[PDB]
Amino acid sequence: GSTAMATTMEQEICAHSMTFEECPKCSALQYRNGFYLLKYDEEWYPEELLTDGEDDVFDPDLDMEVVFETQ
């Protein structure tokens, strides 16, 4: 159920930040979300193919301030 086992875990795990129940909301909010949705990318094939787990995207340092939604 929604990737997770019907959100039994309850540890707020998602591509963005929230639970799998709120995963569609999270996906809608940022769109990129570790390039979970392939369709988002212009070339279709994104740099990060893998579904974001725990801060998988932007692993190398980009900005000093760590904000999940950073462009």
List interacting residues with Zn ion (CB under 5 A): 14-16, 23, 26-27
Q: Is 52 annotated as a binding residue?
A: yes
Q: Is 26 annotated as a binding residue?
A: yes
Q: Is 41 annotated as a binding residue?
A: no
**Would you tell me how many other CB atoms lie within 10 Å of the CB of residue 34?**
22
> 15 or 57: whose CB is closer to Zn ion?
15
What is the Cα–Cα distance from 14 to 44, expressed in whole angstroms? 22
> 4 or 26: whose CB is closer to Zn ion?
26
What is the Cα–Cα distance from 65 to 28, expressed in whole angstroms? 24
Binding residue positions for RNA: 26, 50-54
